[PDB]
Every structure is written in C-alpha cells, then in structure tokens.
Design a protein around this nucleic acid. Structure first.
Ligand code: ZN
Lengths: 138, 128, 61, 50, 189, 316
RNA sequence: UUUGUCUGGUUAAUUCCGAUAACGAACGAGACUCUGGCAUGCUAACUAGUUACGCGACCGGUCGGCGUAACUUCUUAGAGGGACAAGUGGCGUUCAGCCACCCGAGAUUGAGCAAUAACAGGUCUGUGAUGCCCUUAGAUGUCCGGGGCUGCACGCGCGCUACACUGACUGGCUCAGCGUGUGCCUACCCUACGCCGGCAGGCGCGGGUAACCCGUUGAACCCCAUUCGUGAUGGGGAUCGGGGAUUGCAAUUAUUCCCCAUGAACGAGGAAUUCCCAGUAAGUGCGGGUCAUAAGCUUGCGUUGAUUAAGUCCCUGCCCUUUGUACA
RNA sequence: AAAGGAAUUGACGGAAGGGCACCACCAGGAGUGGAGCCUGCGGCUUAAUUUGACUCAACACGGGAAACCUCACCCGGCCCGG
C-alpha cells in the first residue's frame, strides 16, 4: 500500500498501488486503452523496461486530473514508476530498489524526477512573455 | 553573475575577526553559528554570509589574507628558523683589492680570513 | 587529398561580426604538425575537422 | 611564389620606402594620434614588441 | 533491447566517420522507444548534441508557422516515412538517416566579410555539430519544399530525401546545396 | 561515474606458433601452400603503421610456405602512445617507460579479455578440440577462445590460409548468438600527450577519445580491425580501462565498453581494404619466387622502411 | 576645483579584486516584498478528498452510485526548513571569479520598487487642482429633439484572415487554468433542468452574495477513421438579396445573431525593416475590461511546444576617458 | 564698459580610443512591407465631420469598440439653476 504522485505540469497523476495479482488501470481504463497512440510507449515504458515480473505483486490504479493530454501521459508514467519504487522500498528489500532505480534513472530521468518548468506569465506591451509589438518609427 | 557585494564580504570579515573560536570549514555549521553571533535580517543574506565565511575559512588557514587582521598572527603565535651553521660563517671571502686598501687603512687586514681576488680588466659596464 | 585535424586549444573568437573561432589543429591521417585553422560554428577541444585544402594557415579576418 | 622559383633557396628581397608625412595627413592617416597633456612628455617611441 | 518504434534495432548501424561519432547520438544509451522525449536539452551549450538524432529529426520538421508547436504530427510523419524506407529500400533505416547526415554536411563553407555589404567572402571549415544540424536543416528543406506543391505527400518525399542523401544523387537539395555552398567557398579563394 | 573495479584474472594464455600448432601440421598434409596466424597476417597488412621493431619469419618447405613467429620476442606486447606528436621516451626505473607500459598493456589486455564475461554461463562450444592442450586436466583454467581455420583463393596458384580466432559470444537482439572479438584500450596518464581524462571527457565525447587514440595508438588499433575482417566477425567490441591514480600502476579500473562493426571500424581508423591485401601479396609475390632457406621480415626502429631478409643458417 | 570614483583583471552592475595620497562611508545596484519550483515532517478540516468498509446497480472487474469510520497522498494554506558557487577537477597576477560535473525539486524563475538632476516632453478634455484672459440670457451655462464624429480621386501605421494535402469537410474520442456572479446613488446578474422550434430564442420552476449552484468549468488545437485530389478547386468567404429573433425610447448611415444564395484579389510578397534565448518564439482556445446589445483591441490564464546563439563592436544608439574651443 | 591673458567644471564636434544592450547586428525563427478586410492618423467634403498627440517619447493612444446619454460638434426651440 502506497499512493504516490507524479507531475509534469498542472496535470497531476497519482497511482494507487496495493497488493495483488497484477493490474494497471488509469481511471478505470487499462494502459492499452488511452487515446494517444503515437505516445503509446511512454505509458508502457515501465512495462517494457522493468518487465511484467517486476509488477507481479501489485494492483496499480491511476487517477489523473488537469493539464493537457501529453502532460497527462508524462504524469502517468512518472506516477507508475514512483508507485513501484515506493512499494519496493516499503515492502521489498532496498537492493531491489537500488537495481530498479539505476535501471529507471539511467534510461530517462523524468521517470523518477519531476519537471520544474511552468509557464511564465505574460507581461504588458506584447502578446507573450518576451515578444513585443511591432513599433513603427515613421 | 554571482559576485558577493560589500555587505556579504565586509560583514563576513567582521564576523571572522571576533568569534574565530566558533567558526570552521563546513558550511552547515557556520550557517547555524551565524544567528547566535549576529542580528541578521532574512536568511538569503545569512546564507550568503555563511557562504563567504566558509570560502574565507577555505582560504585563510594556509597563509595571510590582506583584509584580515593579525588575529591571524594570534593564530600564528598560537599554531606557527636558522641553519646550524650561519651563511655569514664562510671561510674564504673574496675581496676585490680596493676593499683591501680600505681595510688596510682602517687598521685591519693584518688578520687574514679573507682572500683577495684578481681585478677586472675592461670597464664596459654601461648599456649602449 | 583530404586531411583530418584534431583541436587541442581554442584561441578566442575573431572576425568583424565575431563569428569565427580559430583553434590549434593537429593532423592525424598520414602527417604530424600542429597549426592554426579558423572554424565556423561551435567547437570544443577534441573536435575533428575535415580539411579539403590541407595546408593553409589563417591569422585573422 | 616559392613553388615557381627556378632557384633553390632564394630569399626574396625587401622594399625600402622612406616616407615623409605632413602633420595633417598623419592624423588623417592615423600614423600619429592625439595624446594627453601630461603624456606629451613621453618621447619614447611606441612598443612594437610584446 | 531498446528498439525504436518497437521495431528498429540500433545495435548494428554503421557510423563511418570519426568526426560525427559523438555528435550523431543513435547508439545504445540513446536508443529510445520514441522520437518524443519532451526534453530540457537546449538549455546549455553542447547538451543539444546528445539529444538523440531522431528527436532532432522530428523537431526540425515542425518548422513553418502553419505547423508550429505540433509534435505528434511529425512523430506520425517520421513513423510512416521510416516504414516507407523499409518498404522501398528494405535496409535498416537508421543507416539511411546516419548516411544522409554524414554525407550531406558541407565540409567547407564561406563567411561574409567586407564591412557589411561589399561582397568579398572568405572560406573556412565547419565544426562537426554545425555540420550535423546544417545537414538536418538541408534535409528538412528539400522535402517540405518538394512536397509543398505536388500531388506527392510528405512522407514519401522525406524518406526519399533521406535516401537521396544516403546515396548521393544530385536531385537532393541537401546534396545540391552542399555542393553549391562549398563550391562558392572554393570560388572565393 | 558509477564504475566497477577491475580484478586481475589468472588464466593460461596461448601465443601459439604455426609450427607449434599440430593441427596446422595436421592440415599441412592435405591442403594449401601458405599458412600463418592471424596475429602475423594482420601485421603484414598493418606494417604501414608500426614505428617500433619486431621480426616475422618466412619458412619455405617445398611448395608449402609458412610465416612463423619469433620465440624470444615481445611481439604480443602492445605499443603505447606511439604515433603521437611526442612519443613516450622514458626510462626503465620510471614507471612510464615503454618497457613496462607495454608489459602493463598486455597484462591489461589479457585481464579484460576474460573480465567482461561471465564464468557462470555454459560456453558456446565447437564440435572440434584444440590440439595443443590435453583435455584430461581438471583445472579448466583456459580463457574462452575459438580457432577457425579458413581458406581463401588468391590467383597465380597461391592459397592463403589464415589461422583466425573468435573470443566471445552474446545473445542477439532477435534470438541469435552473436560473436565477439575482445580487445582493450588503456589510459595511463592523461596529461602529457595532449591527453583527455576519460572519466571527464568521454561523457559526451566518445569521438574525441577515438581521435585521440587513432593519434596515439594507431598501430595497435589498426591491427585489430585487420584481424577482424579476416575473422568475418559479426560484432566488434573495444574495451576502455584506466589506472586509478595517474602514476602508480598496481590497480586499474574499467569505465565502460563500446560496440562496433569492422567496416564501421576500418574507414573510421583510415583502413582501406584494398591497400592492406596488396602489401600482403607483394611480400608473397616476392617470396614464392624465393628458394628454400630461412627468412625474416622486420620493421626498422628508426626509419619508415621494411625489408625482406634472407636469414642465413640455423637461427630460427 | 581636483584625488577619493583609477592603468588592469573580473562582474548582469562605480559588482568586486588589485594598483594606489588616500582612509572610511551614504543614495542608486544588490539586499528587501509578491510569485514559481520541494516536503509521505508538523497543523489540519461534511462549502475539500483519499481509502478499508455496508448496501444497491451491471457481465472478480466497472460505477462522479448512495450513505458511513480511520487518515492528510492527491485540494486548500499557514509556521519553520531548503541553494550557499557550498563539494570536487581545471583555468586564474593563485585574489576577485570563470568553466566543467556529481548529490540534489532547484546550480542566472519572473515581475513590483527605483538615485543626482533636467526637458519649454504630454495632460487646463480626470478634477468642486487651477492663475489670468474670455463668454455670461437673441449664453460657449442648461435641457429636449434630428444630424455629426461612420462620410471618400487618395496616403501612412497598428492588426485580423488566408494563400492549402502537415491541408479542407463530416463523424467519434478526451483534457485545463487565472478568475466573474443579484449592486447606497441606479433600471443593469451567473445560469442548472424540463417543454416548443433547424438557429438566435420563447416559457417555467430552481440554485447561488460563492471552495457549497452554474462547475468534474465535459474549451480549442492536438488524436482516429470518411470524402476531396492540385483546379483559383470542396481552400479564400470580401462584396452583395430576401427572412426570423434579441437588446433598447429608438437600429436607416445594415449594432449583434442565424437560415439560404453570391463566389473578388490572393498561389507565399521586391528595396527597407519589426520582434525574440526555455516551457522562450509560435500554433490554439478560455476569463477580465468597455457593455441595456459586445471585441478583428487590450489585459491575463492555461494547453501543444521547437530550430538557433552560449559570442562580437561591423551596423544603430548610448555611456566613459584623453583632446580642441572665441560656445555657456 | 569692457576688449584681453592664464586656469577649472560643463555642453558640443564633420576628432582619437575603450565599453554595453536582441528597444544593436551575427547564428537563426515567426513575421512585417505586396492582398481583401476591422481601426487610427494625413488629406478631401461637410452645417459639423469636435478634439490633443506628429523620431523613438504621435498614428487598437485619451483605458475613446460613440445608434440617444456620452457630446464637445450643427440646425431650431424651452430653461434660471442671474
Ligand atoms: Zn600630407
């Protein structure tokens, strides 16, 4: 039993992971049923990387809210990886956590470590943060 | 640019002149030292003061700093040379003979520990 | 023919508009010498340059 | 030039031009430039060496 | 066994140059499943080189303003173009992208001098990371301009462009402009 | 930056001469006119990059011609930092003489040829035995080594048999087995010869490192991809090891490993396949016109010139 | 009146180091306030949620489906903690610092604030801030009514929409976030849900002064299939006709909306030039303003998210030092 | 009733040398300038087309997207709140 989040943006995913016979369900749909399928491997990246034997005791239910679609995908994979590592640190021994963290971090650090980038504000005198209006001279 | 301004490197030095018996080389000890020993407003000044007293204690224990006082010499009188035979105890001192005429007309040179060497030929000492 | 060169040191940015660096380039292919060439683009030490003309040294522009 | 010389090891000659210049066309031609009131007493010629 | 798009082995493809060996990132650490990484890579000098070469390839196809910001559209385009490589040529496509980028970076170039508007140019040579990204820009031009007004769609045109720089036919705008902007550096000498 | 210590591994290491192979003597009866080892026929191909000196014998017996190796020679020993703008010149009682650093080099080669494998796996075995060892010894202390005796047809009635090797195998990407030749590059002190600290410098720049050791170690690295295409290898692997502190060689550490293909490795090190076989054949287009007797091929210590030498009676 | 305030190195910075007839300082910069990024550690809660239950519904799973007992992971927001060029390697008059890399959420987040002192800069159309001059009852006060600022042989600028196949059109699918909400003066509001229409709308019962109701804010782009096939074409939707509804005392010089019809240049724009360095440009929608009706403008919010630089004084301005004056 | 001499600070140059900045160029991207259209300003007409602003430091700026009020502006009339 853990519930541990992952976020990229205002998209927020938290996986509910407790003991079982294997499961992945993102808001009641499983991982093979999410809408963007050019990004299908991003959610499956702990399943392809860790193998289905590393998930072999848990029932992971993911609940997401907020953000866009791609930021939601990038919060799903981070919340899944943090779910398995939090279960592994509490219930399995820590050398298995060490093995799973070097196999997860060295591939991609957004699987375990969040994104601190947020959208910077518009200021006046131009249509974005940095861009400015056209400024005729004559 | 991360250059430290006047207050974070003058105040850190006036913190280092007194209170040297409390400071050290680790940043997290000195950061906790700095609120008993001062009244500093908010912490970003206090972390910058702690970073400069850690850099100054990184500098100071291997030699003299210009800005620091002789409280350093109180450390060097608290923590710190001649040879066996002196470099002025040599046994033959070469003397070019105008010096020997001077010593003869100062009522010395009867005593001989010296050895007069041969005078130079040529007077080309200037630059062109 | 075509001689390859290896960068050992960067000698400052040059040019009127500041666009070209010049570097110390040591040759690898059949020859051994260490000369100056000037580049266009970002270099680090350990970059490998490919010289079509293989002899020309470059002081300033 | 050196690949076209019929003579092996011919060191090429130098060009010896003695130039006089007026005082207007040096400051136009940047040979000699205007200096401070207190460094005008420097009449050492400027360094050409590093 | 990290396989690109689920199907592409990265273990076997041959970088035949030394100068781009650390500047085309395709080998075993940079084997990723997808051309999307959502990375922080252009935040420092020389972290953008060891972005994967496929990720730079799909980002450089985002270029004009009708198609600004849209990444998964180019993930789809590069997916169907790689399948077009495997069907038209039947060799490993990662050798086709590696051969296009190694072959098409122009090895000599010209600089403008002459005090800002009298044209006398000077020839110098090109740094290898500039050769790599100049090659991706000359490969993404061509194909969009050669599928701007045609009945041909973009994926066949882009995969044929990477083919046409992989073998060096001189219909290739990457290879055509490579020879042109190196031959004017030959001419201003 | 997550590295692992390199242990020293004691195995028995075979340097076997063509005459010291009895299967080359068993294959002498029924085939062929030209027999040698793939150490030697690489060195006839990679004679264009040697600066330091050796010799290679040519042994004609009848119409059967043999290239055998010397017995008192440092021929297996790798040259070190050889082809740089400044070579190592240093003296024997210093640690960085080319006497001990070559002796450091093939100690480090013979270490990492077994280090990067498991002992624990069942070996990929050949149906033939190796003949210079009896199988009844229960010590089992050989390295994993293969020997492949293969047959080329060369025109003008010359038959080139190269005694070749393969040194490893790994499970493939698809379910195949895939054959590994293992050799080892080494970093002794990276300050002197424009040197790069591989703990610092190959974290983006693996390609600076290959350009460094093409400039430093060209005769060593060209010889490996000479023997590789004669093996017909499915994979090439190169190993990277460094010493722990920069002056004292008693410990060395593995940083990581790289994987190549040999045509990917020939043109990247400026090996053209047309030139190397031509200088191979030119000695043979001489030496099939020579009579019987003893012969010798050396590279000079000072000058960029080689000779075919008739050796007079009974040295080797 | 000058030095202090500089030959030089360094800095985003007269920021510092160093040289030194200067030594110590003050304002400005920096510090500081607000925001962004971290916390299984504290405080925690029917106007906020998780989960172990109890039951209902559907073939163990699904249920934003209906109500209970423990917790504070997700929501809210306080009190402290935290990142300091601190640790290491190199460069460096071994001094300022600069570069590289681990551990790390984070190794230049962004805005407010803003000195000496000046311009004949703008504003007497914000003022019951005003000095004087003006008009002051056939008014330049003040009201009611039609008209005007909207006119067009014509320029210049801010912008929007496009010149299509990465597209267009039709269906499906799935996700935000800043915030607004019934009013001294004073009529002016956010809208659920059910019925009637193809729309704007008509009609009624409800909820809400707000984390409670609109609201899980079911947003657009993006995604997945259909058709179209390089044509001024199914892009472009300019101009132009009849009709219906809403607001209002009143829509003509069409305010707005919808139905149908009409299909103009435009096929990627020449000399000059504008803007920009990481969640940035750009693509794309949603709130606030003005508002009885309301956005091609402005002010914010998020979403999809890159190429290229890690520098120079060539150009354009600006500051500084030396220098010339009959200029003040 | 000053003309002039020497010297200091400042302004200025069609002088010499440094420095900074994407309101500078270079690396480059979206554009703008050509096209229909909303909108401001110059003119032109009107009874009036009210008005201030003209290089950044004017021209989607007066929070100015005005159908009446706004509303200054025109044509005709009531009104003292002298
Ligand atoms: Zn003159």
């Amino acid at each position: 039993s853990v519930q541990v989040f992952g976020r990229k943006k205002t998209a927020t995913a938290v996986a509910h992971c407790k003991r079982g016979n294997g499961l992945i369900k993102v808001n009641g749909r499983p991982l093979e049923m999410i809408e963007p399928r050019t990004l299908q491997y991003k959610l499956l990246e702990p399943v392809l990387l860790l193998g289905k034997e590393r998930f072999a005791g848990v029932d992971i239910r993911v609940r997401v809210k907020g953000g866009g679609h791609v930021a939601q995908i990038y919060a799903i994979r981070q919340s899944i990886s943090k779910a398995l590592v939090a279960y592994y640190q509490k219930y399995v021994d820590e050398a298995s956590k060490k093995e799973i963290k070097d196999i997860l971090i060295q591939y991609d650090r957004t699987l375990l470590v969040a994104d601190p980038r947020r959208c910077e504000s518009k200021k006046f005198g131009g249509p974005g943060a940095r861009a400015r209006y056209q400024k005729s001279y004559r | 640019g991360r250059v430290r301004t006047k207050t974070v490197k003058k105040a850190a030095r006036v913190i280092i002149e007194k209170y040297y018996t409390r400071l050290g080389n680790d940043f997290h000890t000195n950061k906790r030292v700095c609120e008993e020993i001062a009244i500093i407003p908010s912490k970003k000044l206090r972390n910058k003061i702690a970073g400069y007293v850690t850099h100054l204690m990184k500098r100071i224990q291997r030699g003299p700093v210009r800005g620091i006082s002789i409280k350093l010499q109180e450390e060097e009188r608290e923590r710190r040379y001649v040879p066996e035979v002196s470099a002025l105890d040599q046994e033959i001192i070469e003397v070019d003979p105008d010096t020997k005429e001077m010593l003869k007309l100062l009522d010395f040179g009867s005593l001989s520990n010296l050895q007069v060497t041969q005078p130079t030929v040529g007077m080309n000492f200037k630059t062109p | 023919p075509i001689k390859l060169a290896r960068v050992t040191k960067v000698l400052g940015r040059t040019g009127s508009q500041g666009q070209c660096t010049q570097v110390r380039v040591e040759f690898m292919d059949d020859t051994s010498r260490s000369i100056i060439r000037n580049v266009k683009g970002p270099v680090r030490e350990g970059d490998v340059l490919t010289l079509l003309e293989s002899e020309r040294e470059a002081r300033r522009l | 030039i050196s690949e076209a010389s019929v003579f092996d090891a011919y060191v090429l000659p130098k060009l010896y031009v003695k130039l006089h210049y007026c005082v207007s066309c040096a400051i136009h031609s940047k040979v000699v430039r205007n200096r401070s009131r207190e460094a005008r007493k420097d009449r050492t010629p400027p360094p050409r060496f590093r | 066994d990290i396989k690109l798009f689920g199907k592409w082995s990265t273990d076997d493809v041959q970088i035949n140059d030394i100068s781009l060996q650390d500047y085309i990132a395709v080998k075993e650490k940079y084997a990723k499943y997808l051309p999307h990484s959502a990375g922080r890579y252009a935040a420092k000098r020389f972290r953008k080189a060891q972005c994967p070469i496929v990720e730079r390839l799909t980002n450089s196809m985002m270029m004009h303003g009708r198609n600004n910001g849209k990444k998964l559209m180019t993930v789809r385009i590069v997916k169907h173009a790689f399948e077009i490589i495997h069907l038209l040529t039947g060799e490993n496509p990662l050798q086709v992208l590696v051969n296009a980028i190694i072959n098409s970076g122009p090895r000599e170039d010209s600089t403008r001098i002459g005090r800002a508007g009298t044209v006398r140019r000077q020839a110098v040579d090109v740094s290898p990371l500039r050769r790599v990204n100049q090659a991706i820009w000359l490969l993404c031009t061509g194909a969009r301009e050669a599928a701007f007004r045609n009945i041909k769609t973009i994926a066949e045109c882009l995969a044929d462009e990477l083919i046409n720089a992989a073998k060096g036919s001189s219909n290739s705008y990457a290879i055509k402009k490579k020879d042109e902007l190196e031959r004017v550096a030959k001419s201003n000498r | 930056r997550s590295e692992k210590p390199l242990r020293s591994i004691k195995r028995i290491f075979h340097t076997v001469t063509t005459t010291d192979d009895p299967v080359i003597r068993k294959l002498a009866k029924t085939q062929g006119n030209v027999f040698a080892t793939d150490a030697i026929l690489a060195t006839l191909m990679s004679c264009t990059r040697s600066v330091y000196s050796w010799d290679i014998v040519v042994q004609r017996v009848g119409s059967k011609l043999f290239f055998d190796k010397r017995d008192n020679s440092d021929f297996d020993l790798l040259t070190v930092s050889e082809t740089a703008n400044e070579p190592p010149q240093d003296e024997g009682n210093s640690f960085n003489s080319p006497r001990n650093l070559a002796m450091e080099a093939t100690y480090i080669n013979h270490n990492f040829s077994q280090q990067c494998l498991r002992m624990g796996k069942e070996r990929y075995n050949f149906p033939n035995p190796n003949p210079f060892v009896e199988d009844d010894m229960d010590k089992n202390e050989i390295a994993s080594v293969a020997y492949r005796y293969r047959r080329w047809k060369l025109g003008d009635d010359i038959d080139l048999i190269v005694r070749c090797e393969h040194d490893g195998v790994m499970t493939g990407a698809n379910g195949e087995v895939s054959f590994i030749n293992i050799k080892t590059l080494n970093e002794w002190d990276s300050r002197h010869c424009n040197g790069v600290d591989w703990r610092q410098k190959l974290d983006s720049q693996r390609g600076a490192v290959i350009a460094t050791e093409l400039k430093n170690n060209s005769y060593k690295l060209a010889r490996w991809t000479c023997c590789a295409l004669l093996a017909g290898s499915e994979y090439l692997k190169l190993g990277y090891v460094s010493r722990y502190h920069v002056k004292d060689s008693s410990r060395h550490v593995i940083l990581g490993t790289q994987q190549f293909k040999p045509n990917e490795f020939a043109s990247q090190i400026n090996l053209s396949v047309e030139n190397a076989w031509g200088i191979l054949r030119c000695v043979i287009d001489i030496c099939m016109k020579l009579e019987e007797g003893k012969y010798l091929i050396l590279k000079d210590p000072n000058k960029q010139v080689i000779r075919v030498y008739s050796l007079p009676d009974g040295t080797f």
